[PDB]
Amino acid sequence: IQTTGKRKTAIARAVIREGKGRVRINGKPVEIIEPEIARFTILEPLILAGEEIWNSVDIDVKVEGGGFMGQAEAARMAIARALVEWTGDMSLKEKFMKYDRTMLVGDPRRTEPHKPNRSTKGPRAKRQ
Amino acid sequence: DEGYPAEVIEIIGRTGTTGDVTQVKVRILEGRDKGRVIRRNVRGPVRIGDILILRETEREAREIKS
Amino acid sequence: YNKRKPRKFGKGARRCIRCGQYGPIIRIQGLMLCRHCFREVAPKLGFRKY
Amino acid sequence: AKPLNERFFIPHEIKVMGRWSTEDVEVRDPSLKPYINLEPRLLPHTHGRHAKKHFGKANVHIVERLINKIMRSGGSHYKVAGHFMRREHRSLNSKKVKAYEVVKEAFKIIEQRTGKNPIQVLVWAIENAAPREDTTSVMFGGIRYHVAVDISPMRRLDVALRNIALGASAKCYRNKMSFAEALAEEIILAANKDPKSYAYSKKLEIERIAESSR
Amino acid sequence: ATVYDVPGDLLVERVAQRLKEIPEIKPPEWAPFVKTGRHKERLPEQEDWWYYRVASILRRVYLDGPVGIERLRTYYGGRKNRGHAPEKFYKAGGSIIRKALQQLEAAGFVEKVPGKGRVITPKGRSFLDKIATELKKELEEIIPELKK
Amino acid sequence: RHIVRVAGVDLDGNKQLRWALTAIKGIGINFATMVCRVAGLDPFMKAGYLTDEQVKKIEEILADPVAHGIPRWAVNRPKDYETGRDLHLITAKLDMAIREDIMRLRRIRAYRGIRHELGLPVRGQRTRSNF
Amino acid sequence: MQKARIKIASTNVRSLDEVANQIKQIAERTGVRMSGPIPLPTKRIRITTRKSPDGEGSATFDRWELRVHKRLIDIEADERAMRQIMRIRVPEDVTIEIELIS
RNA sequence: CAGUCCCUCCCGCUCGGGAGGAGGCACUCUGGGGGGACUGCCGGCGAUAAGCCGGAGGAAGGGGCGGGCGACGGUAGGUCAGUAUGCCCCGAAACCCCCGGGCUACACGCGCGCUACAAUGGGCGGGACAAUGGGACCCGACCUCGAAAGGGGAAGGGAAUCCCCUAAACCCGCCCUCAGUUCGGAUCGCGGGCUGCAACUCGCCCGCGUGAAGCUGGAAUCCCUAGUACCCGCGUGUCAUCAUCGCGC
Structure with missing residues (x-):
């Protein structure tokens, strides 16, 4: 089963199937990703799911675009959609929207364009 | 720390120089004047049910005018 | 001896087509046109504001 | 790297950072109980629309707020005592991982010095650093005069956290002693x-002045 | 298992100490007198710096497949000071990694695909993934969860 | 050895050799660690245990850098004006060589010497609101 | 097995649209297979210039934009089909480039 | 390896793990049409109007968000040194061409920028990350050599198809441990490299030596309100080189 999730410019395509429990981002294990803070948010959603479903399926997600943290956000975003699609269980959906509404909603924030008069510093950054 | 917590029950309206300060009404939940209603001043945003801390129950704000 | 030296580079190399200035000549895929000139002719190019 | 993956997996049972589940921590002061967030979270970094709401700071976790103040x-x-407190060299802003690591080490340091939950130490420090009086100018006919004022609890939280961060940053500045310490x-x-806590001292100062400007 | 299943920070050191055995790779005479990059201001602190570099280079051949001189130069390039002007990104030197590539090819671990770069031999693949399986069999003990 | 004299200039034994050599004017950290490697010693070891044989090795390296493996371009004044050889200037041998360069620039009435005589920037820097 | 790749460039989306309608309605009349019209990423050209003719005054700039739309249509090699493409009336704004690939 | 029978290769505990070709449109991406958000519904306020506040649901609510378009008139503001232009001056000069210098020069007052004043750091390896664009006397992979600046060849590409191309900020394992110094590089010499006929006046880069002030800055005062402010880099105009320049990502 496929699932998509966008963030900033990060886009994540996840495929999940019956399996041991291995979770692979870009073909790399979920447990040895060097950014620890990003690893925590990557591993946040499935914790509420329970180890049964953690060990009942295998998940592989490929991300591209944005930064590492945007990539982690997109990965978690797509993860929640994929897993709730597999279960089709309302109770877990309630658990997610209790913990975080963006799990099945997403953050539509995007960068504002920079404007003249010191364009580099930002849309709202001006001289003295 | 012999402070007197009290509960916001009503907001009279903005006051003070900049209008940042808010004139509020507070009910004394504890101490020697339990249950008393006091007009008081607040700095920082306020809601209906904030537990304002009081150094004294003696101070009551002057009535605001329009 | 009264002929200008051909200049392949430098500001003297390029020249606005319309008004004949040596100043800012914009070359977005080669217009060879002055900055003041571009304003009066952009809508005629089909350019549009957005 | 064993400590890294260890701390990664140990909070698998829903714990702040890596350790110190918050059920033990208790909010003694009645005022900040309905305003300090103690919800169970693994990573305290929402990026949420807390700015875009009137009281979106109620739902932000306390440690997240501390990291934000450090930011x-x-x-x-x-200019505290004539010091342009400035982080030219690798400023914490736009780098939340650095502040995350620094507060991680500070939590450990608090834990082993106190031999208890660092989070409860933070709660006590904030409770004891919160001012109870301030002043404001009120005029009538143009004649200004200072008037003693009470503070909303959330503002007390804000100023206490910012003052603690101020004291820490000033202490580390220009000095051998590192920032987490x-x-x-x-x-x-x-x-x-x-x-000698800059936060607690400044709390005493602001609780004065208003003391005599009633 | 594969290199993808282990951290690179430990794997590069393991590969460096393993390749230190084979004499095909050797720092030339100018090696100890040249810093590791144009973007770098100071000489390498350690003297094993050579054997890590190859241990890095070969690693990318396992990942990025056929890659030539210039893209590798770009990957190792970094941020350097420019006086009062702010820092800027620059490219690592050429010969430093070029001779490393020649040494790796002569060792038979890698081969060349002209017009595309250099790819990794099945011998090099088997060597790297044997090191990786060694490391993973190790790591599964200190970290049980990697068994999954 | 809290004090270790090398080629006429003292070094503190507390400092590492790559840092101790930098106390020598005319030798930098990039030269300090590179002669540390040429001597075969750890760059970071304490200079307090610098036995005199290492000191003799250091000064004999300084006698001829190229003969000890130091490249022709790691020297400060390669292709010397008076012999066409690459030698690493240091101490007074650096000082009077630069003084000779200054005399050379002065006697030719060139711009560089003109600025050197007047205390002005050789390389055409703008001094309308600076210096 | 031989196909014709056709690339149509147009600044006007509609001038492109009716020409695409012509070439697609050729297909079913001719009874020859036709892969759907592929819309390439529309190419945006941006040019910015300060409004002031002299130097005085604040800084104000004008950003002019040209959007040129690119579309691909790939069709089989049918002599009767391709005989009717040069008879297509094309507007001046639109341009057509055809390659015949195997 | 959406799934993918088929074929090949590497590991292994032979279960399984990974890469390449076929493969079809899953899904991403892209561009054409349409819907969705309309105070739409509920409660209160508002005179029962206009409208406001609150609540639900919903990706998105109270002009959804960000932009373009900015009148009547004035500023004898500036622009005739871009164009057109009245009056007046010269008209072998105030016309044209060329050479050389200058347009930088200097005790400073002064607007706006960059760096420094370091534990945050400095140094060594590895790990995860963009899009704006731009490319034919061009982008140039890739091969070879030089430590490098760069040099010889050259695939692909006149553009979803080739290239600029990697991110940096961040973390991991380790050394230096607080000092005007293991910070900072100005200034100064040598050699080498690059564009242009030529770069002292008047360009940039590579290596060595060199190390300047500055250790937080009074009066005063600017900016900002959500992907916003701060930090970090990249593309692009002028351009053969040259930005701490301007616009954009």
């Missing part, structure tokens, strides 16, 4: 109403 300490109007020491001093 923005260098270079501004304030400064922060942990500031927290420890604040927890027990020690007058």
Whole structure:
């Protein structure tokens, strides 16, 4: 089963199937990703799911675009959609929207364009 | 720390120089004047049910005018 | 001896087509046109504001 | 790298950072109980629309707020005892992982010095650093005069956290002593109403002045 | 298992100490007198710096497949000071990694695909993934969860 | 050895050799660690245990850098004006060589010497509101 | 097995649209297979210039934009089909480039 | 390896793990049409109007968000040194061409920028990350050599198809441990490299030596309100080189 999730410019395509429990981002294990803070948010959603479903399926997600943290956000975003699609269980959906509404909603924030008069510093950054 | 917590029950309206300060009404939940209603001043945003801390129950704000 | 030296580079190399200035000549895929000139002719190019 | 993956997996049972589940922590002061967030979270970094709501700071976790206060300490109007407190070199802003690591180490330092949950030490430090009086100018006919004022609890939280961060950053500045040690020491001093905590001292100062401007 | 299943920070050191055995790779005479990059201001602190570099280079051949001189130069390039002007990104030197590539090819671990770069031999693949399986069999003990 | 004299200039034994050599004017950290490697010693070891044989090795390296493996371009004044050889200037041998360069620039009435005589920037820097 | 790749460039989306309608309605009349019209990423050209003719005054700039739309249509090699493409009336704004690939 | 029978290769505990070709449109991406958000519904306020506040649901609510378009008139503001232009001056000069210098020069007052004043750091390896664009006397992979600046060849590409191309900020394992110094590089010499006929006046880069002030800055005062402010880099105009320049990502 496929699932998509966008963030900033990060886009994540996840495929999940019956399996041991291995979770692979870009073909790399979920447990040895060097950014620890990003690893925590990557591993946040499935914790509420329970180890049964953690060990009942295998998940592989490929991300591209944005930064590492945007990539982690997109990965978690797509993860929640994929897993709730597999279960089709309302109770877990309630658990997610209790913990975080963006799990099945997403953050539509995007960068504002920079404007003249010191364009580099930002849309709202001006001289003295 | 012999402070007197009290509960916001009503907001009279903005006051003070900049209008940042808010004139509020507070009910004394504890101490020697339990249950008393006091007009008081607040700095920082306020809601209906904030537990304002009081150094004294003696101070009551002057009535605001329009 | 009264002929200008051909200049392949430098500001003297390029020249606005319309008004004949040596100043800012914009070359977005080669217009060879002055900055003041571009304003009066952009809508005629089909350019549009957005 | 064993500590890294260890700390990664140990909070698998829903714990702040890596350790110190918050059921033990208790909010003694009645005012900040309905305003300090103690919800169970693994990573305290929402990126959420807390700014875009009137009271979106109620739902932000306390440690997240502490990291946010640490985020923005260098270079501004304030010159504590004639010091342009400025972080030219690798400023914490736009780098939340660095502050995350620094507060991680500060939590450990608080824990082993106190032999208890660092989070409860933070709660006590904030409770003991919170001012109870301020002043404001009120006029009538143009004649200004200062008037004593009470503070909304959330503002008390804000100023206490910012003052703790101020003291930590000032202490580490220009000095051999590292930043996490400064922060942990500031927290420890604040927890027990020690007058050398910049936060607690400035709390005493603001609680004065308003004392005589009633 | 594969290199993808282990951290690179430990794997590069393991590969460096393993390749230190084979004499095909050797720092030339100018090696100890040249810093590791144009973007770098100071000489390498350690003297094993050579054997890590190859241990890095070969690693990318396992990942990025056929890659030539210039893209590798770009990957190792970094941020350097420019006086009062702010820092800027620059490219690592050429010969430093070029001779490393020649040494790796002569060792038979890698081969060349002209017009595309250099790819990794099945011998090099088997060597790297044997090191990786060694490391993973190790790591599964200190970290049980990697068994999954 | 809290004090270790090398080629006429003292070094503190507390400092590492790559840092101790930098106390020598005319030798930098990039030269300090590179002669540390040429001597075969750890760059970071304490100079307090610098036995005199290492000192003799250091000064004999300084006698001829190229003969000890130091490249022709790691020297400060390669292709010397008076012999066409690459030698690493140091101490007074650096000082009077630069003084000779200054005399050379002065006697030719060139711009560089003109600025050197007047205390002005050789390389055409703008001094309308600076210096 | 031989196909014709056709690339149509147009600044006007509609001038492109009716020409695409012509070439697609050729297909089913001719009874020859036709892969759907592929819309390439529309190419945006941006040019910015300060409004002031002299130097005085604040800084104000004008950003002019040209959007040129690119579309691909790939069709089989049918002599009767391709005989009717040069008879297509094309507007001046639109341009057509055809390659015949195997 | 959406799934993918088929074929090949590497590991292994032979279960399984990974890469390449076929493969079809899953899904991403892209561009054409349409819907969705309309105070739409509920409660209160508002005179029962206009409208406001609150609540639900919903990706998105109270002009959804960000932009373009900015009148009547004035500023004898500036622009005739871009164009057109009245009056007046010269008209072998105030016309044209060329050479050389200058347009930088200097005790400073002064607007706006960059760096420094370091534990945050400095140094060594590895790990995860963009899009704006731009490319034919061009982008140039890739091969070879030089430590490098760069040099010889050259695939692909006149553009979803080739290239600029990697991110940096961040973390991991380790050394230096607080000093005007293991910070900072100005200034100064040598050699080498690059564009242009030529770069002292008047360009940039590579290596060595060199190390300047500055250790937070009074009066005063600017900016900002959500992907916003701060930090970090990249593309692009002028351009053969040259930005701490301007616009954009």
